[PDB]
PDB file of all heavy atoms in Angstrom:
ATOM      1  N   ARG A  34      12.708  18.703  -2.371  1.00 34.30           N
ATOM      2  CA  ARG A  34      12.635  19.753  -1.380  1.00 34.30           C
ATOM      3  C   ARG A  34      12.988  21.119  -1.941  1.00 34.30           C
ATOM      4  O   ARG A  34      13.922  21.255  -2.688  1.00 34.30           O
ATOM      5  CB  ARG A  34      13.541  19.480  -0.214  1.00 34.30           C
ATOM      6  CG  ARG A  34      13.720  20.716   0.586  1.00 34.30           C
ATOM      7  CD  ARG A  34      13.774  20.547   2.031  1.00 34.30           C
ATOM      8  NE  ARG A  34      12.846  19.592   2.601  1.00 34.30           N
ATOM      9  CZ  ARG A  34      12.194  19.778   3.735  1.00 34.30           C
ATOM     10  NH1 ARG A  34      12.321  20.902   4.387  1.00 34.30           N
ATOM     11  NH2 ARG A  34      11.420  18.836   4.198  1.00 34.30           N
ATOM     12  N   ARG A  47      16.001  14.643  -3.438  1.00 35.37           N
ATOM     13  CA  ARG A  47      16.337  14.063  -2.140  1.00 35.37           C
ATOM     14  C   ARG A  47      16.360  12.540  -2.114  1.00 35.37           C
ATOM     15  O   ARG A  47      16.689  11.970  -1.098  1.00 35.37           O
ATOM     16  CB  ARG A  47      15.344  14.586  -1.107  1.00 35.37           C
ATOM     17  CG  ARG A  47      15.545  16.041  -0.783  1.00 35.37           C
ATOM     18  CD  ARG A  47      16.792  16.250   0.064  1.00 35.37           C
ATOM     19  NE  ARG A  47      16.965  17.621   0.529  1.00 35.37           N
ATOM     20  CZ  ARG A  47      17.515  18.603  -0.198  1.00 35.37           C
ATOM     21  NH1 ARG A  47      17.901  18.411  -1.452  1.00 35.37           N
ATOM     22  NH2 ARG A  47      17.639  19.813   0.328  1.00 35.37           N
ATOM     23  N   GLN A  95       0.179  25.912   6.794  1.00 48.06           N
ATOM     24  CA  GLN A  95       0.670  24.614   6.298  1.00 48.06           C
ATOM     25  C   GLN A  95      -0.335  24.003   5.338  1.00 48.06           C
ATOM     26  O   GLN A  95      -1.499  24.265   5.495  1.00 48.06           O
ATOM     27  CB  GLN A  95       0.936  23.694   7.433  1.00 48.06           C
ATOM     28  CG  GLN A  95       2.145  24.103   8.290  1.00 48.06           C
ATOM     29  CD  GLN A  95       2.109  23.389   9.624  1.00 48.06           C
ATOM     30  OE1 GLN A  95       1.467  23.871  10.521  1.00 48.06           O
ATOM     31  NE2 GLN A  95       2.742  22.182   9.726  1.00 48.06           N
ATOM     32  N   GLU A 231       7.042   6.676  20.010  1.00 54.08           N
ATOM     33  CA  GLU A 231       6.862   7.064  18.671  1.00 54.08           C
ATOM     34  C   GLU A 231       7.954   6.374  17.830  1.00 54.08           C
ATOM     35  O   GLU A 231       9.108   6.381  18.199  1.00 54.08           O
ATOM     36  CB  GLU A 231       6.967   8.607  18.569  1.00 54.08           C
ATOM     37  CG  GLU A 231       6.719   9.123  17.196  1.00 54.08           C
ATOM     38  CD  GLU A 231       6.769  10.642  17.081  1.00 54.08           C
ATOM     39  OE1 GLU A 231       7.038  11.319  18.082  1.00 54.08           O
ATOM     40  OE2 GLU A 231       6.466  11.167  15.988  1.00 54.08           O
ATOM     41  N   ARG A 233      10.725   6.117  15.286  1.00 57.75           N
ATOM     42  CA  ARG A 233      11.781   7.100  15.096  1.00 57.75           C
ATOM     43  C   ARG A 233      12.749   6.624  14.024  1.00 57.75           C
ATOM     44  O   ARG A 233      12.916   5.449  13.818  1.00 57.75           O
ATOM     45  CB  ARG A 233      12.513   7.390  16.421  1.00 57.75           C
ATOM     46  CG  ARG A 233      13.305   6.140  16.892  1.00 57.75           C
ATOM     47  CD  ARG A 233      13.623   6.204  18.277  1.00 57.75           C
ATOM     48  NE  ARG A 233      14.617   5.179  18.675  1.00 57.75           N
ATOM     49  CZ  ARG A 233      14.985   4.981  19.936  1.00 57.75           C
ATOM     50  NH1 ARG A 233      14.442   5.635  20.970  1.00 57.75           N
ATOM     51  NH2 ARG A 233      15.943   4.112  20.175  1.00 57.75           N
ATOM     52  N   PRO A 234      13.351   7.565  13.281  1.00 59.43           N
ATOM     53  CA  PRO A 234      14.311   7.249  12.268  1.00 59.43           C
ATOM     54  C   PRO A 234      15.639   6.838  12.866  1.00 59.43           C
ATOM     55  O   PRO A 234      16.126   7.445  13.825  1.00 59.43           O
ATOM     56  CB  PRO A 234      14.471   8.570  11.496  1.00 59.43           C
ATOM     57  CG  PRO A 234      14.118   9.610  12.475  1.00 59.43           C
ATOM     58  CD  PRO A 234      13.131   9.019  13.412  1.00 59.43           C
ATOM     59  N   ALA A 235      16.234   5.801  12.289  1.00 60.56           N
ATOM     60  CA  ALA A 235      17.596   5.395  12.700  1.00 60.56           C
ATOM     61  C   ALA A 235      18.623   6.346  12.098  1.00 60.56           C
ATOM     62  O   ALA A 235      19.705   6.568  12.655  1.00 60.56           O
ATOM     63  CB  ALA A 235      17.842   3.938  12.266  1.00 60.56           C
TER      64      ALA A 235
ATOM     65  N   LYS C   7       8.554  16.485  21.782  1.00 82.98           N
ATOM     66  CA  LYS C   7       8.896  15.170  22.264  1.00 82.98           C
ATOM     67  C   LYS C   7      10.358  14.961  21.863  1.00 82.98           C
ATOM     68  O   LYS C   7      10.801  15.477  20.832  1.00 82.98           O
ATOM     69  CB  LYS C   7       8.051  14.117  21.590  1.00 82.98           C
ATOM     70  CG  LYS C   7       6.529  14.312  21.867  1.00 82.98           C
ATOM     71  CD  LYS C   7       5.715  13.183  21.297  1.00 82.98           C
ATOM     72  CE  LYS C   7       5.579  13.220  19.781  1.00 82.98           C
ATOM     73  NZ  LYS C   7       5.218  11.839  19.253  1.00 82.98           N
ATOM     74  N   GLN C   9      13.748  12.140  21.833  1.00 83.37           N
ATOM     75  CA  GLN C   9      14.319  10.850  22.087  1.00 83.37           C
ATOM     76  C   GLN C   9      15.783  10.974  21.772  1.00 83.37           C
ATOM     77  O   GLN C   9      16.153  11.573  20.752  1.00 83.37           O
ATOM     78  CB  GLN C   9      13.629   9.800  21.220  1.00 83.37           C
ATOM     79  CG  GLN C   9      12.183   9.513  21.587  1.00 83.37           C
ATOM     80  CD  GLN C   9      11.705   8.298  20.846  1.00 83.37           C
ATOM     81  OE1 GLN C   9      12.186   7.193  21.133  1.00 83.37           O
ATOM     82  NE2 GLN C   9      10.737   8.466  19.925  1.00 83.37           N
ATOM     83  N   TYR C  11      19.258   8.600  21.308  1.00 85.32           N
ATOM     84  CA  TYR C  11      19.546   7.231  21.001  1.00 85.32           C
ATOM     85  C   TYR C  11      20.626   7.046  19.932  1.00 85.32           C
ATOM     86  O   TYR C  11      20.948   7.955  19.212  1.00 85.32           O
ATOM     87  CB  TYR C  11      18.268   6.514  20.570  1.00 85.32           C
ATOM     88  CG  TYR C  11      17.571   7.091  19.323  1.00 85.32           C
ATOM     89  CD1 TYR C  11      17.747   6.497  18.093  1.00 85.32           C
ATOM     90  CD2 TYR C  11      16.827   8.256  19.411  1.00 85.32           C
ATOM     91  CE1 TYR C  11      17.118   7.007  16.965  1.00 85.32           C
ATOM     92  CE2 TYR C  11      16.171   8.796  18.306  1.00 85.32           C
ATOM     93  CZ  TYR C  11      16.333   8.176  17.088  1.00 85.32           C
ATOM     94  OH  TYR C  11      15.689   8.762  16.021  1.00 85.32           O
ATOM     95  N   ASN C  25      21.840  10.117  17.846  1.00 80.80           N
ATOM     96  CA  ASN C  25      20.664  10.782  17.366  1.00 80.80           C
ATOM     97  C   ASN C  25      19.882  11.509  18.464  1.00 80.80           C
ATOM     98  O   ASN C  25      19.754  11.007  19.564  1.00 80.80           O
ATOM     99  CB  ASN C  25      19.754   9.724  16.758  1.00 80.80           C
ATOM    100  CG  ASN C  25      20.300   9.126  15.484  1.00 80.80           C
ATOM    101  OD1 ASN C  25      21.100   9.741  14.755  1.00 80.80           O
ATOM    102  ND2 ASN C  25      19.831   7.921  15.164  1.00 80.80           N
ATOM    103  N   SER C  29      10.244  15.941  17.915  1.00 75.22           N
ATOM    104  CA  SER C  29       9.025  15.746  17.115  1.00 75.22           C
ATOM    105  C   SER C  29       7.831  16.289  17.879  1.00 75.22           C
ATOM    106  O   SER C  29       7.952  16.666  19.050  1.00 75.22           O
ATOM    107  CB  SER C  29       8.835  14.258  16.826  1.00 75.22           C
ATOM    108  OG  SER C  29       8.530  13.543  18.011  1.00 75.22           O
ATOM    109  N   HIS C  32       5.266  22.709  17.750  1.00 69.44           N
ATOM    110  CA  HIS C  32       4.690  23.810  16.969  1.00 69.44           C
ATOM    111  C   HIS C  32       4.763  25.040  17.839  1.00 69.44           C
ATOM    112  O   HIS C  32       4.391  24.930  19.038  1.00 69.44           O
ATOM    113  CB  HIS C  32       3.230  23.484  16.628  1.00 69.44           C
ATOM    114  CG  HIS C  32       2.779  24.003  15.316  1.00 69.44           C
ATOM    115  ND1 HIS C  32       2.655  25.349  15.067  1.00 69.44           N
ATOM    116  CD2 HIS C  32       2.434  23.371  14.172  1.00 69.44           C
ATOM    117  CE1 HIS C  32       2.269  25.533  13.812  1.00 69.44           C
ATOM    118  NE2 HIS C  32       2.120  24.347  13.246  1.00 69.44           N
ATOM    119  N   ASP C  54      16.070  17.446   7.089  1.00 75.94           N
ATOM    120  CA  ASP C  54      15.253  18.543   6.658  1.00 75.94           C
ATOM    121  C   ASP C  54      14.026  18.658   7.464  1.00 75.94           C
ATOM    122  O   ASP C  54      13.359  17.674   7.696  1.00 75.94           O
ATOM    123  CB  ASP C  54      14.841  18.287   5.187  1.00 75.94           C
ATOM    124  CG  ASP C  54      16.020  18.347   4.202  1.00 75.94           C
ATOM    125  OD1 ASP C  54      17.058  18.975   4.499  1.00 75.94           O
ATOM    126  OD2 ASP C  54      15.917  17.760   3.103  1.00 75.94           O
ATOM    127  N   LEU C  55      13.648  19.884   7.835  1.00 75.64           N
ATOM    128  CA  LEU C  55      12.451  20.082   8.665  1.00 75.64           C
ATOM    129  C   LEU C  55      11.219  19.556   7.930  1.00 75.64           C
ATOM    130  O   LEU C  55      11.020  19.877   6.753  1.00 75.64           O
ATOM    131  CB  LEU C  55      12.285  21.533   8.940  1.00 75.64           C
ATOM    132  CG  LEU C  55      11.117  22.034   9.809  1.00 75.64           C
ATOM    133  CD1 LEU C  55      11.245  21.554  11.248  1.00 75.64           C
ATOM    134  CD2 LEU C  55      11.082  23.546   9.717  1.00 75.64           C
TER     135      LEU C  55
END
Side-chain angles (χ1 to χ4, degrees):
Chain A
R34 165 142 319 220
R47 289 287 186 277
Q95 290 163 275
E231 183 178 2
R233 67 199 192 185
Chain C
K7 299 185 286 159
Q9 291 191 68
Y11 60 100
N25 291 335
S29 68
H32 213 293
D54 293 337
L55 181 66

